[PDB]
Amino acid sequence: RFSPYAFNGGTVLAIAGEDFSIVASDTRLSEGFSIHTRDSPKCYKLTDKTVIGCSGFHGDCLTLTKIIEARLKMYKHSNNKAMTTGAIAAMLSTILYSRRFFPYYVYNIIGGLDEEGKGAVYSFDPVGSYQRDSFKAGGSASAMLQPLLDNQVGFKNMQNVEHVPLTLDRAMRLVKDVFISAAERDVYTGDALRICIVTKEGIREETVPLRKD
Amino acid sequence: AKRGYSFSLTTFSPSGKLVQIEYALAAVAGGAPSVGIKAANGVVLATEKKQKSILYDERSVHKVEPITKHIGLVYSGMGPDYRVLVHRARKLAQQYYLVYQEPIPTAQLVQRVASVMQEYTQSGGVRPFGVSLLICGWNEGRPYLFQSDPSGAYFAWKATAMGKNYVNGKTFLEKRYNEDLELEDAIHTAILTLKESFEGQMTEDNIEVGICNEAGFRRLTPTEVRDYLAAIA
Amino acid sequence: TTIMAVQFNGGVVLGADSRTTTGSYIANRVTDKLTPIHDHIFCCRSGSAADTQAVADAVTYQLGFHSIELNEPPLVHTAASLFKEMCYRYREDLMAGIIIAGWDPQEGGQVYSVPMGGMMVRQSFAIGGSGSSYIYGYVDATYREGMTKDECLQFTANALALAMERDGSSGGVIRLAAIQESGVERQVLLGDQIPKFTIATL
Amino acid sequence: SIMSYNGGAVMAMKGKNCVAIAADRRFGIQAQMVTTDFQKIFPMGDRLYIGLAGLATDVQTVAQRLKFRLNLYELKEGRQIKPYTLMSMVANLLYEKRFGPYYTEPVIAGLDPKTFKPFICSLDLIGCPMVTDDFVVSGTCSEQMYGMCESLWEPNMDPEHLFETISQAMLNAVDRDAVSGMGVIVHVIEKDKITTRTLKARMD
Amino acid sequence: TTIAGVVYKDGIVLGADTRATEGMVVADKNCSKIHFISPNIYCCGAGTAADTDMTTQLISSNLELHSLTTGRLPRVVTANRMLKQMLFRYQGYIGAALVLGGVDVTGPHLYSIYPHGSTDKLPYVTMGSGSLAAMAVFEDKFRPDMEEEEAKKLVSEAIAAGIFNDLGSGSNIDLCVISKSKLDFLRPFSVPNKKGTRLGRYRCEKGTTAVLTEKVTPLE
Amino acid sequence: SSIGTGYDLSASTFSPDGRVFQVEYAMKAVENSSTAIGIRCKDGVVFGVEKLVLSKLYEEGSNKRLFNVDRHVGMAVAGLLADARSLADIAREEASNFRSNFGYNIPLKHLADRVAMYVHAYTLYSAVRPFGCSFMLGSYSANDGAQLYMIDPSGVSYGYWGCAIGKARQAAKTEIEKLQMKEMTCRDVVKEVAKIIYIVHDEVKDKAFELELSWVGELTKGRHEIVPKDIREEAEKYAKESLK
Amino acid sequence: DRGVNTFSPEGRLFQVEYAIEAIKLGSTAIGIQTSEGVCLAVEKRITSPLMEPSSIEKIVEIDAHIGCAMSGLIADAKTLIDKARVETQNHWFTYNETMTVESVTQAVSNLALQFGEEDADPGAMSRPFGVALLFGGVDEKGPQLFHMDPSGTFVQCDARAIGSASEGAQSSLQEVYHKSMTLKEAIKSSLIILKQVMEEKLNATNIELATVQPGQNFHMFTKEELEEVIKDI
Amino acid sequence: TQNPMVTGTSVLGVKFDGGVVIAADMLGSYGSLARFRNISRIMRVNDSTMLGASGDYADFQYLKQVLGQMVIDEELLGDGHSYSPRAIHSWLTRAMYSRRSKMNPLWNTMVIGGYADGESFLGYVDMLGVAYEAPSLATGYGAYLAQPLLREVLEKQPVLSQTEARELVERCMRVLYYRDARSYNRFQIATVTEKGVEIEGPLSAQTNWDIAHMIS
Amino acid sequence: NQYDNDVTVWSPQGRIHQIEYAMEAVKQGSATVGLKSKTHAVLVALKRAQSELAAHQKKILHVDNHIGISIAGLTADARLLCNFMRQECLDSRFVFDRPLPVSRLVSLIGSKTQIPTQRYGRRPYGVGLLIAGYDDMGPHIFQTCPSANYFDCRAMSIGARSQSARTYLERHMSEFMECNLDELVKHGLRALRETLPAEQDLTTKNVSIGIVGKDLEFTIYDDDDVSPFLDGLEERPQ
C-alpha cells in the first residue's frame, strides 16, 4: 500500500556541564542505500539558551521544528518572555503526545541552560516521555556512543578514579572522538560533524569533516 | 447568505386568542366557495373555479387534486398555500404505503396533514396556512369527509360549506341533507348549493367536481359535468 | 473493449467495439460505447460499465447547464475538463478510461484522452481499453500526417477489426462516428462488412 | 454460525379456520443448556402471534421494539392490527438495519380480525416476507422441519387434527437437532379460544 | 432465479420463475418475481430478494408521486434513471438485478439493470442464476417484430430452460404482457412441475401426542 | 418617494408603492462618491477614476479604485471603498474557480453575471444589507473583442460603450456622447478619458484630486495594466491645456 | 429596543457602559502594592446577623502566588475566577511553570467582549460581566497588582479601590501611599480607608483580608490573626 | 493517490554559475507500456523559478493548476513582492506533508530550480515531506546512476559554466536511456537565469551501440 | 435616531450611522503618531492613566519581527484584532518561510473588518490602528479604521486632539524621506507634544516608542529605555 514513515538515519548527541551545553550531530541524510545530501545538520537553534536536535524521519523533523518556532513566538507575545529550556522541554512533551496514535518518528534531544545558568540536557522519545540527564545519545549510532559516555563521563566500572567534573575542553574532544568511531561502523553516520555549543555568551558552531563513504 | 428566524409569529393575545390564526380563518372566508357531501354510497367534492378573463386555460391547473388512488382534496382561500399541502399529503400517503403496504386510511391522512398545519402556527418565522381543506376517501367499506382548518384542528362532516357565504351554505345544506342519499343525487345537491353564491351562470368550465367511491377517487370530465349542470341530469 | 478517436482537418472520427464482458460471459454483444454529451461532443467509454455511464450522464448535466449560461457552443476542452475533474477526484473509486473527441467553432476537431489516473492531454489519435494493447504497433506504423475524413474512417475501422480479432474482451460489431461543422453522422459495420484479414495457415 | 449460537426452532401451520404456532423452549449458549423455560412466541393482539428464532438477544429486542410500534399503531388507529399490516411492520423494522441486521427469523401466525381468515408467513434477517398456504419454518433445524411438514400436512384440517400434525412435525425434527429441544410449546388459535399445550419431549 | 424480457411489434413480454431458495433448499414454491412499478411499467427481479422488494417499492412510490404531479403517464427512462442513480450510489451493496420493461408514448422500452448501477437497452435481456439457459433460447429463436402469441411462446421456453437446467430455478412460469392498450398479467401461465400426490397417508390419529399441561383462553 | 415610517429599515421589506428603499439608499452612497469613468474603444477599454485626496499626508497610490480581478479583467469601483474591496475579492475568487474547473480564462460576460448574482443575494434578506458600491468590468480578447460591463448595488449588469458612475455621472455622459469611441484607437482615448474627469471635477466644492488610469486591449496584449507614467503625464497635460 | 453590540453617538457600547454602573452598587475593595507584598481588603457587608460570615468570600485564590478581590455581581465573578484557575493549571501542564500576574489578568480579559446574538455558538454569552477585579500576586518581577473592568481594559496599579465608595477611597489612597512604605503600613492604611467608607463599624467578622508575599504563599487572615491589626483603630 | 497509474521517470537538476538547469524526458509510462511519448513534465512557475516532477503525472497536473493560480493571484496585486525559489519550495514541502498526514498523498518527486538575488537555488521534495538543498539533484533511477556522475564533476569543479553544465546533463541523460527501462530518448532542457525561465523543445541524446559486436 | 441601531440599516442620505458611531471610539482614545523615513518606521504613542496612583496603559503592541502596531480606541477590540494579525504572520512564515509583506496583511484586515459591517447583530471593530512595518519595498505606515477602508500614508496621527499633530506632520512632510533614525523619532514625539495642553508635556512615564526597519527588528521602548529619545528636546513653544 503506502508507508507514511521513512528511515533517514542520523545520530544526535548532547552533553551537559556546569556552565555549558554541547549538542552535536552528523550532516548525512540518506534513504535505503543512497545518500540524499551531505550537508544536512540536525542541530537547530531555537533561542539564545536552547538548541534542539532531531533524528529519524526527516519529514516529521522539518514540520516539528516549524511547529516549535511558531509556538516560541506565541509564548513570546502573550507572556512577554523568552521561553526557558525547561519550559520548551515540557511543551515538546505535549506536542509529541497530541500525535499519540499517529506518532512522529522522531528522537529529540534538547540541550541548553536552565534558570540558574547550569548545563541541562533533556531526552525525548517518539511519544513524549522526557527526563533530565547529564548526557544522552539518540539515533542510528546511539548504541555505539552511549557505552563510551557511560565510561568516560559517568565514571562507571572503574575502581579508583578521582571523579573529575566535566570541562568544556575535554567534552569537545570527547564528542569528536566518538563520531569518528561511529563513522567507521555505522553507515548512516559520516560526511561532516556539526557541534553546537550553548554558553552564557551565546551559540557557537563548529564543523569537522568525517568519513564520506 | 440567509439566517432564518427562530421566534414564533403567532402569539396569544390579552383576550386569549391566537391572532394570526383568526386572520387566517378570514383569508379562507374571502376565498372561492367549496362544498363536500358524504352519501354512504360515496363522497362528492365541488368547488368554484372562476377564471374570469377567458384567456385562462381551464384544464391546465386544477383545484380538485388527487392524493392517492382513493383520496382527493378540495380547498378554499389561497391557491399557492394549498398546492404545498397537496404535495405534503401526497408524500405522507406514500410514506405510509412503504411501511404498512396498505392504502392510507382517510382519518389517518388528515391527522398527519393537520400536524403539519399545527407546526406552522408554532414554528419560528412562519405564518399559518390560509387554507381550509376538504378531504374525501374510501376505506373499510365506508366513505369519509373531513375538514382541516388553519389552526390544525380536524372535524368529521356529513355535509359542509367553505369560502364566501359558507354560513348561507351550511344553513342550505342542513335543510337539503338526508340520510342514505345516493352518490349521483349527492352531486346534484352539491352543484346546487354552490349555485347559491355564484351570480354568473354556471358552465362546465366555471366549476370543478370530483367524486370518491368504492372504485376510487377521480375527477369528473367536463362532459360529465355538462350533463349534471343543465339543471337536471 | 477497444475505443479509438482520430483527428482530421474538418473534425474528428470516433470508433468503438460492442462487447461488454462480466468474466468470460458476454452480457451485451452490441453495446453502444459512443455516448453523446452535446451537439458535437462525443466520448468513448472503457472500464467499469456502471462507472463510465454515471460520469458521462453527469458531464452531460454539467456541460448542458454550462452551455446555456454562457450562451455559446461548448468547447471540447471544456467537456474534457469536466471528465478530468471527476476522474481525478474519485480516482480510487472509479475505474474509467474516457476518450473525449468533438468539434467547436473556435478550435475545430479535437481529441482528448483521459485514462485511469485522471490526467488530460490532447492527441492526434487516442486508443484505450483492453484490446488497444494489441494495436499499438499497427497504429504507429499506419498513421499518416494529414489524412482526409474518408481515410480516417478506414484507419479506425481497420485498427478495431485487428483488435477485436485477438482480444477476447473485444468483439461484436464496429460503431463509427464522424463529427464536423455539418453535424454528426454514424454508421455500423456488420458481420460481413468487417475488414477481413487473412488467418495464418500452413 | 451466528444463528447456531443460541439455537431454536419456530413453526407455523394452516388449518381450516384455525392457525397453529409451535416453538422449542431451550435457551443455551453453544453447547451448554441454561434455561428450560424460554419464551419465543409473543402475543400481538389476542388472535395474532409472532415466533422468533435465532440469536436470543435479537429475539427479545425485536419483540420489544415491535410491541413499541404495535401499541402506537393501535392508539393512533381505532382498530386492531391486521396480519398483513404486522408482516409489513416486521419487514420495515428489520430493513432499517440493512447493513447490521438482527440475527433472527420472524414467523407470524394468526387469524385475520373481522374476516376470520388464516395467515402465515416467515421473514429473513433483513426482512423479506413470503406468504404460504401450508407452512413456514425458521431456525437451526430448518431442513429437518421441512421434511416433516412436507409429509404430514393436509389441506383442510380441524383444530384437533392441526395440533397433532404440528406437534409431531416439531418433536421429530427437534430430536434430530442438538441445539434445539427441552420441551415444545404449541399455541392453537381459534376464533373462540386459544389452546396452549406444553408437549412431553426428550430432555437431552 | 430466471428472469427475462422481450420486445415485440406491439409491446413487451416479461418472464419469471417462482422458486425462492435459502442456500440450497427451496423456501418458497410460489413466489412473485414480476413487480409492479406503474400501471404501464413492470419489472422482474433477481439477486437478493429483500433488496429487490424494497428498491422496487421505493421507485414505484416515487413514480406514483411523479405521475400525479405531472398529470400524465410516467416513462420507462424515468424508471430507469431512478434505479440507475440509486444503485450506483451504494456501490453494488444493494444486490438487485432488475429487468425493466414498459410501454410509453414513445414506444416499448426494455432495460437490464445491474446491482452496481450499469444499464443496458436491448430488445431481449436475461438475468439471474439461470440466465445462461434463457439467453441461449433467445439467441436461437428470436426475430424482430414478432406476434404477441409468438413472443409469449419465446419467453416461456426461455424461462423453462432455466427451470430444468439450473438448480436455482424451478416450479411455475410467470408472464407479464404489456402493450399500447392492453396489459395482461398472467400469474400462472405454465405449471410444468407438480408434486406426486401422497398415496400413503401419514395423518396422526387424535391423541397420539403426550400433553403435560393444557390451558384454554376464551375470546370475543 | 418619501415614505419611511418602516418599509425602509429592512431590505426584505417592500414599500406601499413597490420599492426596496434599502437598495435605493445604497444607491445614494455611490452618488455621493466621486465619478468613475470608463469607455470602450475599437481595440480595448480604458478606465479613469478621480481619486479625491482627503489629506496630503497620504502616499501616492493609496486607496486604489482600480483593481485586477483577473490577469485580463479590470475593475473600476465607485461608492464605499470598504464594500468595493470585498466585491473585488469575490470577483477574484470567481475568476480563480473558473480556470480551476475549465482551464481557459473566464469570459467577462459570464464573470459579470456571476458577481451580479452575489450582489443581488444581499438585496433579499433582513440579515444582510446591500452593497453600497457600483463597479465596472472591462476586458479584451482576440475572439471576444473589447467588452465593458457595469454592476449596480441592486445586481443589474449591462453592456456599455461608455459609462460613468459617481457624483456627476449625468455631466460625464453628455461628454462621452460627443466622442466617436467606436472608431477611435485606445491610445488617443486616454487623452479624452482624462479630459472629462477634469471637466466633471469640482474645484470650488471638492479639494485636490489624483488621476488613475488603466489599459486593457491590443496594446497591452489583453492584460489589464496600469497606464505608464509617460502617457499619464501626456493625458494630464492635454486635460489641463483645454481647461480654459 | 436595541442589540447588545450597539454603539452610542459618543463612541462606546451601551451594555459595557451599563455594566460599569452595576459595579457602583457592589461592595468596596482596596488593594495596595508594596515591595514586601500585595495586600487585598474588602467589606463582606452582612445583611442579617443570622447569615454565616465565613460563607461570604470576596477574596479568592487562583494559585499559590495569586489572589483576587471581586466587586459588583458576585455570581458573575465566580465564573471568571473558575476560568482563571483552569488557565493557570493549563499553563502549568504545558510549560511546567507558574504564570505571571499580567498573563493571568490578560487571559480573563479575553473573555470580556465575548457576547452576542447572531453568528455565535448556542452556549455563548449574551451580556458582559458586571465585575471589577483586583488581581494581586507575586511573580518573577516581584509583587504586582492589576485592575480589570467589564470592558477588558487591564492595567497595573500601585493602589486601587473599586466598589460603591470607590471615588472617595481613591482620593484617600493618594495622600497616604508612597514608594518606600512597608507591608504592615499597607495593611494598616487599608483598614483606615475602609472604615471611613463603610456604613457599619469595622469588625473582625465584618471584613476580609489577605496578603501575597515573596516569602510564603497566599494567606487568608483568620479571625484571630485580624485582631493584631484591628486593635490599631 | 494510493496507486499511481501514468508515471514519469527520472528528473535531473544541477546549478551552475548564474543559474540552474533541469531536464526530464517527455514520457508518461503506463506500467511497462510507454503510452504518452510527448508530454511536458517540466513547468514554469513564475519568472525566476521552475519545477520538474517525477511519478504520477495526473498529480503533477493538479500541482500545475494550484501553483499556476498562486502566481497569477500574486501578480494581480502588483505590490512589488514575488514568490522566491525558497518560498515555492517551502510551500511544496508543507503541501506534500499535509496530504501525507491525511494518508492520501500526491505520488510525486519534485526538483525545484530557481535564481534570485544573484543566488542559484536547487530544492528536493518527496511524496512524504522530506526536503533539503543540494548542488546536484536526481530522482528515481537518476539518484542511482545520474547522481554519481553529477557528484563526480562537482567534486573536481564546484563552479561550472552554462555550457559545461549543459553537456553534463546530456551525458547523464544518455546513461539514463541505456539503463532505465521506463526512459525515452526525447527530453526538454529547462534553464533559469537573470533574464528569465527558458525551456527548449524536443531533444534527443546520441547513443552508441558498438558493444553489440564485441561479444565473441 | 431610527437608523442608528444596526449596521444593516441605511440612512436616507446614504450613510451607516453605526460605522460613524464606531469612528467616534477612536477619537475617545489617546493620540498616537506614526511616521516613516526611507529605512525606518517609527510609532510614537501617548499613554493615559485613570489615576496618578495607577500605571499607564499599553499603547504599542508586538505583532511580528518586522510588523508592529499602535492602537487607539477599545482595548479588547485591539487585542482581538492583534491576535488575527499575529496568526496571519505566523501562517505565512510557517508555509512560505518568508516574512509576510505589510501590503498583504493590511488587505487581510480590510477583508475581516468588512464582514461584521454587513451582517445583522454584528458590530464593527471600534479601534483604529497605525501599522508600522518593513519589507522588500521599504518602510510602511498604514492606517486602519472601524470601516474596512485602509490608508497608505507618509505620516499619520489618530486619537484625541490629533488635529494638532496632523497639521505639524503636513508642514514637515518633505523632511522625513531624507531624515535619519535619531531625528525621525524626534519628529514623532514633537507632533505628540502638540496634542497636549500648554502646561503639561512629554515624560518618561507616558511615552512609548516602537521602531522597525532595515537595521533592527520591532522593539518597544518603555520607561528607562525612552530616556535617550527624550533627552535633547526642542522644548515646548509658548
Task: Please tell me about this protein's structure.
This is part of a larger assembly, with nine protein chains of nine kinds. Chain A is an alpha+beta fold. Chain A has one domain (1-213): 4-Layer Sandwich (Glutamine Phosphoribosylpyrophosphate, subunit 1, domain 1), CATH 3.60.20. Chain A contains four helices and twelve strands; from the N terminus they run ββββββααββββααββ. Chain A has a five-stranded antiparallel β-sheet, covered by helices on one side. A five-stranded antiparallel β-sheet of chain A has the order 5-6-7-8-9, with helices on one face. Chain A is globular, with a radius of gyration of 17 Å. Chain A starts with 10 loop residues before the first strand and ends with a strand. In chain A, 45% of the residues are buried. Chain E is of the alpha+beta class and 220 residues long. Chain E is 30% helix and 34% strand. Chain E has helices at residues 49-70, 76-89, 131-141, 148-165; strands at residues 2-7, 12-17, 20-22, 25-28, 34-38, 41-47, 96-103, 108-113, 119-121, 124-128, 173-178, 183-190, 211-218. Chain E is globular, with a radius of gyration of 21 Å. Chain H contains four helices and 13 strands. In chain H, a hairpin with a 4-residue loop joins strand 12 and strand 13 (197-199). The relative contact order of chain H is 0.22. Chains in contact: A-G, A-H, A-I, B-D, B-E, B-F, C-E, C-F, C-H, D-E, F-H, F-I, G-I, H-I. Chain G binds chain I through residues 2-3, 5-13, 109-110, 112-113, 116-119, 147, 151-160, 170, 173-174, 177, and chain I through 4-6, 18, 21-28, 49-57, 74-77, 79-80, 119-124, 126. Strand 12 of chain D pairs antiparallel with strand 13 (211-218) of chain E, so a sheet runs across the interface.
Gyration radius from CA atoms of chain H, angstroms: 17 Å
Helix-strand topology string of chain H: EEEEEEEHHEEEEHHEE
Oligomer: part of a larger assembly
Strand order of the largest sheet of chain D: 10-1-2-11-12
The overall strand count of chain D is 12
**How would you characterize the largest beta sheet of chain D?**
5 strands, antiparallel
How much helicity do the residues of chain H have? 25-40%
Please name the fourth-level CATH homologous superfamily of chain D.
Aminohydrolase, N-terminal nucleophile (Ntn) domain
How many separate domains of chain D? 1
Order of SSEs of chain D, N→C?
EEEEEEHHEEEEHHEE
Strand percent estimate of chain H: 25-35%
The N- to C-terminal Cα distance of chain D equals: 22 Å
Shape of chain H: globular
Write down how many β-strands of chain H occur, each being a DSSP E stretch of 2 or more residues. 13
Name the structural class of chain H: alpha+beta
The CATH H-level homologous superfamily of chain H: Aminohydrolase, N-terminal nucleophile (Ntn) domain
Radius of gyration of chain D: 16 Å
From the N-terminal CA to the C-terminal CA of chain H, the straight-line distance is 49 Å
CATH topology call of chain D: Glutamine Phosphoribosylpyrophosphate, subunit 1, domain 1
CATH class of chain D: Alpha Beta
Modified residues (N6-acetyllysine) (chain F): 56, 205, 229
Organism (chain F): Mus musculus (Mouse)
Main location (chain F): cytoplasm
Family (chain F): Belongs to the peptidase T1A family.
